[PDB]
Paper text:
SHMTs are α-class pyridoxal 5′-phosphate (PLP)-dependent enzymes which transfer hydroxymethyl of Ser to – typically polyglutamylated (polyGlu) – tetrahydrofolate (H4PteGlun), producing Gly and 5,10-CH2-H4PteGlun. Here we report crystal structures of a chloroplastic SHMT enzyme from the model legume plant, [name] (Mt), which similarly to At has seven SHMT isoforms. [name] is a member of the α-class of PLP enzymes, and its overall fold is typical for this family.
The crystal structure of [name] (residues 82–533), which is the first structure of a plant SHMT, was solved using the recently developed phasing method that utilizes selenourea soaking. [name] crystals soaked with selenourea served to solve the structure experimentally by single anomalous dispersion (SAD) phasing. Based on the anomalous difference maps, at least twenty selenourea molecules were bound to the protein, often via extensive networks of hydrogen bonds.
Numbering used by the authors:
A (entry chain A), B (entry chain A): 82 to 214, 220 to 444, 449 to 533
C (entry chain B), D (entry chain B): 82 to 214, 220 to 443, 449 to 533
The structure:
Amino acid sequence: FLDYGLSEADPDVHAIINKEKDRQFRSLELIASENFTSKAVMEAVGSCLTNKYSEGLPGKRYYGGNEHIDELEILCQQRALAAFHLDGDKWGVNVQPLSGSPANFAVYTAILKPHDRIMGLDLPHGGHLSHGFRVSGTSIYFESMPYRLDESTGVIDYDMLEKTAALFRPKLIIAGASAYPRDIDYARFRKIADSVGAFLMMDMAHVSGLIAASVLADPFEFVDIVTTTTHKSLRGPRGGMIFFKKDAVHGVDLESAINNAVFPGLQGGPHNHTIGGLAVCLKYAQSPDFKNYQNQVVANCRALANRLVEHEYKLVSGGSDNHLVLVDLRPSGIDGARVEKILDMASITLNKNSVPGDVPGGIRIGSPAMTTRGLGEKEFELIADLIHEGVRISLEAKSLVSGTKVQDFLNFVLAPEFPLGDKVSNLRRKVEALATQYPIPGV
Amino acid sequence: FLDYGLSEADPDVHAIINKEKDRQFRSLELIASENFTSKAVMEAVGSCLTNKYSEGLPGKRYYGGNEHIDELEILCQQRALAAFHLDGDKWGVNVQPLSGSPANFAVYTAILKPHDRIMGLDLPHGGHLSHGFRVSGTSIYFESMPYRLDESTGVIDYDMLEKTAALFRPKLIIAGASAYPRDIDYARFRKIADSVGAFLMMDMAHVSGLIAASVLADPFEFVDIVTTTTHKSLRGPRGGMIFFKKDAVHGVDLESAINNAVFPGLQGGPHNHTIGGLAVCLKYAQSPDFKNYQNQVVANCRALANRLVEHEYKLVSGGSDNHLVLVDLRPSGIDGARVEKILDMASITLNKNSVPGDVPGGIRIGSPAMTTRGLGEKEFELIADLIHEGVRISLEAKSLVSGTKVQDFLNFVLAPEFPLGDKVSNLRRKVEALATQYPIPGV
Amino acid sequence: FLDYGLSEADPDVHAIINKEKDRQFRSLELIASENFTSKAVMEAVGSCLTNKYSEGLPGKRYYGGNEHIDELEILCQQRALAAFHLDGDKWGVNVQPLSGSPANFAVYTAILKPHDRIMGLDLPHGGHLSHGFRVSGTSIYFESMPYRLDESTGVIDYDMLEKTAALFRPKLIIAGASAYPRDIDYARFRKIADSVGAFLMMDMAHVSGLIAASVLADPFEFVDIVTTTTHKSLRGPRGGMIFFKKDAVHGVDLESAINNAVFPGLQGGPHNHTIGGLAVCLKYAQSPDFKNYQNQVVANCRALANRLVEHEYKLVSGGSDNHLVLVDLRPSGIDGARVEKILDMASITLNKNSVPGVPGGIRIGSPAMTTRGLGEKEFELIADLIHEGVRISLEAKSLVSGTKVQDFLNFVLAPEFPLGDKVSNLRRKVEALATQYPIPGV
Amino acid sequence: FLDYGLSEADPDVHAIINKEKDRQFRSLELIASENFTSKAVMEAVGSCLTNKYSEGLPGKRYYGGNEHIDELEILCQQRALAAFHLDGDKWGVNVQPLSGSPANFAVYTAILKPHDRIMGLDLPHGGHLSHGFRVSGTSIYFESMPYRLDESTGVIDYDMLEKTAALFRPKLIIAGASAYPRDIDYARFRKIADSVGAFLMMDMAHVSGLIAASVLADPFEFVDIVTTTTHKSLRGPRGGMIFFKKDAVHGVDLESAINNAVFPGLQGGPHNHTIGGLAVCLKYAQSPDFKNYQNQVVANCRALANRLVEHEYKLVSGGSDNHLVLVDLRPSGIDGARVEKILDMASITLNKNSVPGVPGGIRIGSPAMTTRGLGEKEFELIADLIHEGVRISLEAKSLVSGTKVQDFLNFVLAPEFPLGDKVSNLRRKVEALATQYPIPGV
């Protein structure tokens, strides 16, 4: 009977959310996997759509009362196809996966038997866990072998992939990556997949919006299946999708196989509130404004990358074609673990990241979140300068601490006696003075 | 830059959500897996918590900027333990699983190797897909064998489980079920698990709130691991949890194993907005009001069950100890598929369901959703009467249609010429006159 | 360069063979799995057939020079079909498996995927390791679940097998057993297999000769596939065979699959010397004398069973339909391992065996001594000699303080051993029976 | 009841053995995998050892009556250790495997779980089926990936193996090969295995005699486990052995694991007759005459290799370090299957073999004819006879219109066959060499 609002029911959680909102506002959020979703997405996600149970697909449901839920899921499917410029006679989409990892695992389950062979980009070389690392589900239930970047160039070693694929004979080759700063040679992937009769998939989670806006090459010209999250580059809620060819691929009806793998294979009832949010975000993904945003994402990342290399940083692969840079900190005399911490103390949020030639040696930096807030190229050049000051503080601290462990560094910088506190505060002040000039979307 | 509300950005989706809200309001929602969550849960779920990326656990994260996210997840953990009256020195909880199915699959991944042996309640006998049916993930990656209800009684055949477990030698035995209307003999489960050295798990998704309020027996006195959804009986957002013993169980550190299985095993970054919602709902789960609600859930289901059996329906297992009844329609001369459809046309939402002795022969009916709205025992007796009128319409229609297929029935009842339309409308009018007397929670 | 006989080339090996020859002559060999093969089988096995490498099948060899090997292999196949009264348009046979376990494992490899489900008779209830039964390779690479004997009747619990198969859904059900003293209800097995869509196989290793001689029921009326060893009741060399229907079964061409599973799947070149000896024994398996022998095997076992019952021993299932009995020694106050050792010291050679409920039983078989010419009256005498052996075993057990079977072994092996004179006296009786009878062999 | 000799009991089998004996005498047997075993081995194999059921290990048997079988099995083990110059505190050996493939499969079963990763030499690059290499059982139950020969040098591409193993992470790397004409760089294999934490095994089936005689390098200095057949270069009966370190390796007690994998894992009762013959051959493998024989094997192969090069044939890797050559016939304008058949019709028995790049090659080995007493000069004559055979094969191919190898087989098998006189003339030369030489055997 009692139906209180959040501030009425639970002031501790309301206070935490407000603090998180305010932290987001005050900080340079440079995590490449983050974005700020819109008020409309949040309202859709925070709605009574959460209440409906609806196993199965539209028109073929396992519970009553699904008229409107079916209209929504159909709408969401249609908008997903339109956003990626897909003919619905050639492609279908499943919009129920709960996230990017389950989306991938549904594909594996759909087209592979257990212990079938998969190749994906190696985790230290920029790939994602769900492509194989036995640490990952992918590696537990299937037989994965990585392909790697050239350690000397930071570019995918296509010739070595071609030789290793002929020996290992994968049934699936996954393109796509977490921390790969360059565009993929999809034709080369297709050639290599065909050389062994493999399925070819793209996990476009990190670049989906850039693909939708035609800033990057289109994997849909070459691959059989495309998976994605919906919250990064797309600016949507936390969800996942799987796109598939409708024509049979190596004698497999991918539509049935994938649908069956999502439900009843791995999931129960879909999260309709999320599907609502998704529908909202895919409408916006078709717009000229979204296309402009994505060009600005890439322009901002380039302005950042250029200013970083003026400060003498090394960038894995020499630069970026997309929304992220991977900085190799080792030639500047430090690692990503130490740097990440100091930057975070100064309200610059990003992540340490392994670089080729393995504590991780790099940091990953992305432009989408702050681009959403309205920062342009000039502001991204200032971000680079601020990151530079933070790396200089980190080098000074690494020098001053006596212990040589990462944990010794941590203890040193988090101690109340920390002698560089004033430099951190001073950097934090400038970080917040930049970030707080810009609005932040959301309810 | 553009940050419109939902009605501003996307009137088609706003209109669908409103329609869904209004359908929920007008209908008797009797799906046992559904509930109406509170305004506070929705506000937490529809918040900027969705924007944060936070791989790992509190205090041990893989990205910067997680001060408040960590405070929230710790809070959520603490409230989960308090809601189930658990000592934190004996139990831990992981609150990141994306739903009930992934939660189960994380447990399997944590404590089993591929092809290890699992026993769970058979799907036609009331179990859930994720316990094994090769249709399910559980059955694809592991070796499942069902245990069954007595087809003659509708009660779990404990003696046959005990004999079959000695022969099959499961490494895991799962208690818990989708459509089991009685309480579980947990001591007997423990005895049987010990007889073969198996792990013992309870999937309490369908009864979690009843367990929290001490209406049913406590699986935590007997089992090693407990999984659950958060949206059914608990009245929370769409999520999942896994509870585990902290003492080693058959030489396994369940805490590390389960945490590792959730991430990096099966999932990426947690859905913090959902964790927010969850925290909210677990606060309310500790309250006297929640305890009263759960006693009313069970009282309402009993009033419904008693009125149904006065109309001469057969109930699987003879009745119910909980929030649901499973009606065996075969002795009344009809199946669940036909009945479900007519009821749904009259705004009574439930689901067809297999009954023991296999189109499915039953319907499953639950009290939580309408109990939340404020219906008492008298109103549930009226619900039974309304269901009875719908079953009578369904029998009349089954008689009048010429084709003997379920699809022939469907075509007949959905046709504009449908000769019993006036009886359906008349029943629908009375259904809506009941439901629209009560408020509905949410934003 | 110099091609000496064995006694000249290697007197130590020659000596050991001389000892074993003598041991065989002096003992009562009652291992149900043993027999005495013929001079003719041994001559083929010890021939120049051992020199030829012949991977593939008759007329499709990976090596040259196999004209005569192909001839032999086909002859061997036609004699296997004839020995079991099989129409060649309905049944085929692969005579390449090296033994029984590899024969079985080749069938699994042929018709199953890894981790597919198999049921067979539980190991303590008379099963073989390579069946339903992680100890065995069958349980390692596949998912096995046992079915058991009804412990109160000592018969296969077909009612419980029907129920458990319905839940477990095996892809393959295996009948046949090492220590099952009754015939198999094949129709009931077929009914059960068909209820789950399973392949049905009989492993007839222990009873193959009795099937060939129509003393027991014919698994070929009902099953899809039959495996066997060639050395036990068939009295051939050590090898294996796989029989299979030639009509497709559950969509599988069993011929193609089984042939590919044996080679290149699990083996290389066949053992052509073995195949030579196998052909010899399969010719003999068609003779009236072989049918007479097999009838005597069963009658000898019945004579022994009945006399052991007169001595108040409990037989699993109350007797036997075949060549073996399984004695439950627990009611007599001792296990099978202690008894096996004492009997062995008095030249009565059998084996400890699990019974329904250290092993509680011994398994006793008639084929080997029936080959040598013993009749029913001699088998009653064998039962008396066994009984005396069991009494000495009981007596030796009471002299032992430690309850560990290793302590017993140590006690009885010691040169001091205080019941040595009882054992010698028994041994004298045992040898005085045995040494009246010829022994086949080179 | 009546124990006749083979010629009386079964004249048809006797006849076939007579034919094969004659075939062996008249032919040049050049299958690298064949040899001619001794009269003494054959006498042990054709003995009463075949009658004994002996599951378990020396002194821990599941059956009674194995006093003398235990004696033999231990003798056989000590002679295997001695034949390969092994300290018994560091190495153990299991002499029960029935053949080479089961030996290998027992090792996998012992130290690996199902779907664990294995690398071995690719089948078209000279590997054996039971290795790295779904065709083989090794590839069915485990996850195999091949390593290959550098196609421009015909040597193992160790640089590419080092890279691919780093990515694939095999739990087991297998050295050894059916058709590899050079010695193995064991130190480099050890280095590679250690880089991924792999077990390292050598399958020495093709070269075991040459290792025993120290003609090739010793895999025992570097590997964890060695498997072998007993019939090829060892000149024993058909069987297998597994050698293993007794110190723990990557946390595994290899002795316990391997013994359990052979029995009860994959086999039943051992073949004691085979073990008898194995003991005989292992005694001979320690003699100076065996070392002299093995040196002659290699010299004969070198004499043949060099003469084939004078005839402008391409040998894979440009020659050989061992008992075999692998001829790439593609530059000469024909495949190995056509050539194998023609050579076989002229009593030159070898096998078609894949080469790097229908099989393009033939494999030729010296052991069998060196056993009979041929020297270097005779092996040069063999190369000349092969050359003539290849010319007739080319000529017969031009008379054939269809490009299918089955059409060729049909052409040459036909009684009309118009090059019959060329083949007879060659055959006369081949037999006139062969029939000057004795043949060992009973």
